[PDB]
Amino acid sequence: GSSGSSGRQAKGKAITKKKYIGIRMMSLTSSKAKELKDRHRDFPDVISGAYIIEVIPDTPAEAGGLKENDVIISINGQSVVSANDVSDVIKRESTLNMVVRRGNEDIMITVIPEEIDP
Numbered sequence: 067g068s069s070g071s072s073g074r075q076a077k078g079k080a081i082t083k084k085k086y087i088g089i090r091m092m093s094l095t096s097s098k099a100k101e102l103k104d105r106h107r108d109f110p111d112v113i114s115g116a117y118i119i120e121v122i123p124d125t126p127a128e129a130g131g132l133k134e135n136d137v138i139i140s141i142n143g144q145s146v147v148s149a150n151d152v153s154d155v156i157k158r159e160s161t162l163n164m165v166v167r168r169g170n171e172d173i174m175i176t177v178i179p180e181e182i183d184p
Contacts, residue, residue, distance in 0.1 A: 085156040085179035088122025089132060091149040110167035112137050116149035130177035132164065139172075140165045157181075 069092070094102075099113030118136040121128045138146055141155045141164045156162060162177035 080184035083157075083181045083183055086125075086182050087127035087130075087132075087156060087162075087177055087179045088125030089118060089127045090120045090122070091116045091118050091152075093149055094137070106135065108135060110137055112139055112167060114147045115139050116146065116152040126178045126180065127162075130162070130164075131173065131175035132166070132177065136166045136168075138164050138166055 094113070094115060094117045096113060102117070103109040103113070116138045118132060118134055120134055121132050138152050140146060141152055141162065142159050143163065144155070146152045152164070156179045162175070162179060164175040164177065165172050166175055
């Protein structure tokens, strides 16, 4: 079930390259999270981070551990509070030491994002 229309990111111009791991996420809100839990018992005891809506297959993120309905609380030893922040570490650092909460504990997700042209 789609959420709506969102055709952001247009043909721009950059100098450096960007990494990719085939993953879709949406800006998590205090109101969205509070409802995500009550609506999804599977949801952890968190409400601040990057919410994964779908992880494209054949990607370094799908095999790493990042699964659908996930919430990143920290990456590379740095706590995140925005899906835009977790995406930065992808191009910032070569490795991706994410930490998502599964079941009732914290699990590390090592992903190797490849540097692709702009």
